[PDB]
Amino acid sequence: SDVGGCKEQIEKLREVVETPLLHPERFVNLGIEPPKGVLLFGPPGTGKTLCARAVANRTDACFIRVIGSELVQKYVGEGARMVRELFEMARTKKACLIFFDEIDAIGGARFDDGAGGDNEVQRTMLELINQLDGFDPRGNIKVLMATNRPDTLDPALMRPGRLDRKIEFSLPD
Amino acid sequence: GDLVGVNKDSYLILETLPTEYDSRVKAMEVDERPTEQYSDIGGLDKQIQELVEAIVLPMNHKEKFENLGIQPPKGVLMYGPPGTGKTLLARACAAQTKATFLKLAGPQLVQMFIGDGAKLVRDAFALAKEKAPSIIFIDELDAIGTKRFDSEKAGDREVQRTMLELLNQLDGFQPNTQVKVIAATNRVDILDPALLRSGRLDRKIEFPMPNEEARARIMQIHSRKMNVSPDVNYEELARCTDDFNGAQCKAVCVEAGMIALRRGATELTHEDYMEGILEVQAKKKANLQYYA
Amino acid sequence: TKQYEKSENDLKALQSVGQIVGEVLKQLTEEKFIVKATNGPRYVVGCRRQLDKSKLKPGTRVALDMTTLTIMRYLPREVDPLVYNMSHEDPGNVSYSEIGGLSEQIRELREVIELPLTNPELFQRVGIIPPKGCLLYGPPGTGKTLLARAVASQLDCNFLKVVSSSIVDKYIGESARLIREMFNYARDHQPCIIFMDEIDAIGGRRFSEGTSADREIQRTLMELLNQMDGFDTLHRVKMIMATNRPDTLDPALLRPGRLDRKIHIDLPNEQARLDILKIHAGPITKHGEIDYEAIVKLSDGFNGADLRNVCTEAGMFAIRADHDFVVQEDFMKAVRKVADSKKLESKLDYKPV
Numbered sequence: 140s141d142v143g144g145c146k147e148q149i150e151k152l153r154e155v156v157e158t159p160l161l162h163p164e165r166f167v168n169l170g171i172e173p174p175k176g177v178l179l180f181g182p183p184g185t186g187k188t189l190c191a192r193a194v195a196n197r198t199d200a201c202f203i204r205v206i207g208s209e210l211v212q213k214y215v216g217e218g219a220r221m222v223r224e225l226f227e228m229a230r231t232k233k234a235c236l237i238f239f240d241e242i243d244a245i246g247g248a249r250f251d252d253g254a255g256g257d258n259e260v261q262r263t264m265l266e267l268i269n270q271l272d273g274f275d276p277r278g279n280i281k282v283l284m285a286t287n288r289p290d291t292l293d294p295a296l297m298r299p300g301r302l303d304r305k306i307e308f309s310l311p312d
Numbered sequence: 313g314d315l316v317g318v319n320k321d322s323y324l325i326l327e328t329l330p331t332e333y334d335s336r337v338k339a340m341e342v343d344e345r346p347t348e349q350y351s352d353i354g355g356l357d358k359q360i361q362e363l364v365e366a367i368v369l370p371m372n373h374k375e376k377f378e379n380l381g382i383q384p385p386k387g388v389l390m391y392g393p394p395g396t397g398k399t400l401l402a403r404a405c406a407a408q409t410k411a412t413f414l415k416l417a418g419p420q421l422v423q424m425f426i427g428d429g430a431k432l433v434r435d436a437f438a439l440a441k442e443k444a445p446s447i448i449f450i451d452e453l454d455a456i457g458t459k460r461f462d463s464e465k466a467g468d469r470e471v472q473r474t475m476l477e478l479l480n481q482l483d484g485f486q487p488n489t490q491v492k493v494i495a496a497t498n499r500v501d502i503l504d505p506a507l508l509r510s511g512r513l514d515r516k517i518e519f520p521m522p523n524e525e526a527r528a529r530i531m532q533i534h535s536r537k538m539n540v541s542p543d544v545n546y547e548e549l550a551r552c553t554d555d556f557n558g559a560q561c562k563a564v565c566v567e568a569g570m571i572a573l574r575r576g577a578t579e580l581t582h583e584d585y586m587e588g589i590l591e592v593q594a595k596k597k598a599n600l601q602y603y604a
Numbered sequence: 605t606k607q608y609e610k611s612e613n614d615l616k617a618l619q620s621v622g623q624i625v626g627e628v629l630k631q632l633t634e635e636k637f638i639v640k641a642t643n644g645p646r647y648v649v650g651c652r653r654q655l656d657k658s659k660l661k662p663g664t665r666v667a668l669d670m671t672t673l674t675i676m677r678y679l680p681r682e683v684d685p686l687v688y689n690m691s692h693e694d695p696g697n698v699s700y701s702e703i704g705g706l707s708e709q710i711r712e713l714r715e716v717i718e719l720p721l722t723n724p725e726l727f728q729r730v731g732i733i734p735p736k737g738c739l740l741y742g743p744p745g746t747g748k749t750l751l752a753r754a755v756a757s758q759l760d761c762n763f764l765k766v767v768s769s770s771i772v773d774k775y776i777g778e779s780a781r782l783i784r785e786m787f788n789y790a791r792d793h794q795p796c797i798i799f800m801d802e803i804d805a806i807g808g809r810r811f812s813e814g815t816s817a818d819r820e821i822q823r824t825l826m827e828l829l830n831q832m833d834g835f836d837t838l839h840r841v842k843m844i845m846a847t848n849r850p851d852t853l854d855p856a857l858l859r860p861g862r863l864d865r866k867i868h869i870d871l872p873n874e875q876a877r878l879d880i881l882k883i884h885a886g887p888i889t890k891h892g893e894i895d896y897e898a899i900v901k902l903s904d905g906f907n908g909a910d911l912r913n914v915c916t917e918a919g920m921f922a923i924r925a926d927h928d929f930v931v932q933e934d935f936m937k938a939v940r941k942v943a944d945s946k947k948l949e950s951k952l953d954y955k956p957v
């Protein structure tokens with residue numbers, strides 16, 4: 140009931156996440172196959188609140204939200220363990236949702252002369268995409284993503300293979 | 313050696329037990345076989361032959377090479393933006409060669425502690441020599457093989473030493489001529505010049521956007537499981553795809569079924585396809601005005 | 605039947621437990637000896653009557669009793685990683701004759717390496733000190749590790765190989781002191797040759813102070829640096845260093861002493877290119893009609909490794925034609941095309957001096 144009048148937006152993102160887990164036998168019957176996930180961004184109204192909608196509309200099993208800046212840490216090599224473990228946890232969590240906020244912080248692309256710099260950043264993003272492109276399962280836990288600007292190109296060029304359904308705000312008509 | 317069994321305070325070794333160590337470092341990843349096969353791709357028939365060659369030819373034709381004095385390739389550089397889709401093809405051909413396949417990710421060499429990646433690579437080719445013949449695959453080599461410029465230092469520098477220790481393994485040691493290893497990068501922007509060798513990267517192919525003929529067939533192999541109305545042009549979509557990718561075509565085949573739910577049609581239609589094309593690409597949205 | 609009983613009687617001797625290793629620090633008196641286990645604790649203890657006080661001496665590895673904590677038997681020395689370093693195998697001999705260029709570089713290293721060992725007398729007359737170190741770097745061209753490795757198998761004698769991955773040692777970077785062990789047995793087993801590959805990782809410049817292990821490596825230098833600024837005679841032993849670029853070596857290693865000489869690899873000359881071509885045409889089967897100069901003219905600026913990769917690719921192109929004997933026409937096809945592709949992948953090949 141907290142929606143601000145957006146109709147096609149909220150609908151098209153409802154069918155990517157809530158309907159597959161609401162009626163799994165339906166899409167499996169008529170499959171084809173549900174999509175992997177979505178991407179949110181644009182003007183601030185309304186960033187990040189649309190996810191709260193999935194929180195209240197979650198049917199049974201709770202889902203996990205993740206803050207972006209905690210991936211990158213001092214003493215490089217902590218993010219490697221970080222990003223890896225939550226995946227295994229999710230696979231035990233049987234279809235539980237994982238959402239990263241402000242991917243633009245850890246999505247710094249691509250290369251500069253010197254000095255790195257982006258090396259410790261590129262590890263985070265690229266290990267993310269590599270572990271996202273694994274074949275087992277992978278991963279049944281679906282995906283959910285949100286940020287501010289469409290940058291950068293590397294994540295933006297890697298998503299359309301593994302992701303779909305990028306919508307733009309809209310924003311009040 | 314090590315692992316020798318000795319009992320508490322007795323300090324006597326009863327037996328010497330093999331082999332090596334340890335847990336995930338011993339076995340990175342156990343890949344039974346991928347489900348995909350080479351029949352799921354199209355338009356790569358010219359460039360898939362160069363990939364299939366370097367891996368298959370050493371296996372069966374060793375008897376031919378001893379007569380012809382031929383040295384088989386080892387590493388092969390496959391690279392491009394998705395897709396392409398190099399990963400799936402390279403893996404799929406590994407089920408057909410029956411050789412043992414070990415999944416390995418590039419950034420895994422980076423660890424919280426020092427010297428881990430070095431020991432890890434040594435431990436990787438260990439069981440590769442034990443499991444010979446076998447196949448090891450790595451991805452995002454460009455990320456862990458950036459040598460920057462000015463010291464000091466590079467965070468990856470321990471992984472550059474580990475990579476240069478790998479190349480050094482193919483340098484000072486001949487036995488690395490067994491158990492081929494495949495590498496793939498998303499972008500050749502940063503590449504180590506030292507990777508040019510028969511045992512290092514040798515076969516190199518630049519993978520552009522798929523041809524129209526290919527984009528038509530690949531989506532048909534993707535939607536061959538789906539129920540489709542027996543009216544499609546195939547030419548239409550192929551011509552209507554610029555800067556598109558083969559994986560974008562899968563996204564289009566799913567988009568066609570996404571609105572089929574609100575359509576109610578149990579069978580997919582021609583117009584649904586082009587609809588889904590214009591949907592996700594190109595971007596959005598604004599409105600049709602000023603163009604009369 | 606009775607041999608089994610011999611083994612079982614050996615078990616009766618296995619009922620005697622081992623002992624703990626320890627180093628002799630000093631002796632306070634003849635009834636008081638200061639010993640230190642490898643673990644860190646120190647102990648003032650006695651000794652039995654089989655050992656001699658003069659033979660013991662401080663800094664000697666000995667075995668202490670499990671309870672009395674006194675010396676029973678001793679050992680002169682031991683080292684566990686080195687045995688691996690003495691197992692390196694380099695083919696040739698023949699491989700030494702097949703490398704070709706660079707001739708005069710080889711004629712420099714042959715001398716600086718081999719002569720001080722065979723004729724030490726010539727050096728003492730003139731008053732010139734034998735060079736105790738040398739620097740061979742690439743890859744402007746290639747052939748660094750090969751050539752030096754060939755010298756290991758040509759000069760025979762002793763050779764020791766160390767991979768640059770042995771310096772870290774995870775926590776406790778004691779491998780720095782393992783360098784002192786290395787030079788210990790280098791002073792015992794002398795003469796010997798030591799190789800150092802990819803020194804840029806372990807000899808960097810600590811320009812930007814940061815992270816953690818950046819510093820520990822600077823401490824490994826101090827072992828190299830102080831042992832080669834000794835206080836020690838490295839004249840009998842020999843060392844070889846190699847890198848991508850002499851940018852990180854610091855004024856410490858670019859200074860003589862540690863690195864007396866420097867030999868850069870150069871791109872193979874077309875005259876040398878004909879040579880290296882020749883040695884790869886031998887094992888290969890070709891048609892009776894052959895012309896190597898076509899390849900030499902068509903292939904310019906390539907690396908000696910890249911030439912061999914091109915010859916192998918010419919042969920690996922013949923298997924598609926399935927022919928047993930292969931003409932050089934098919935060769936020049938595969939050569940020209942694939943080699944030029946190598947030029948497209950040849951970006952950022954320019955390396956500093």
Ligand SMILES: Nc1ncnc2c1ncn2[C@@H]1O[C@H](COP(=O)(O)OP(=O)(O)OP(=O)(O)O)[C@@H](O)[C@H]1O
Nearest residue numbers: 272300353354394395396397398399522530558559
């Ligand atoms: N030219 C093509 N022929 C056949 N299938 C393709 C082609 N291009 C893309 N695909 C399909 O797109 C899907 C997504 O693969 P994608 O391109 O994301 O993998 P990838 O790029 O190899 O991953 P990575 O970037 O980690 O290497 C695959 O299932 C593949 O079948």
Ligand SMILES: Nc1ncnc2c1ncn2[C@@H]1O[C@H](COP(=O)(O)OP(=O)(O)OP(=O)(O)O)[C@@H](O)[C@H]1O
Nearest residue numbers: 483506702703704742743746747748749750908909
């Ligand atoms: N002069 C030569 N004669 C024969 N083979 C050579 C020669 N130079 C290089 N090679 C080939 O190159 C390979 C590696 O030798 P080398 O140590 O020069 O490479 P590298 O120095 O590691 O190259 P880079 O420095 O670019 O990594 C060998 O397997 C060998 O077959």
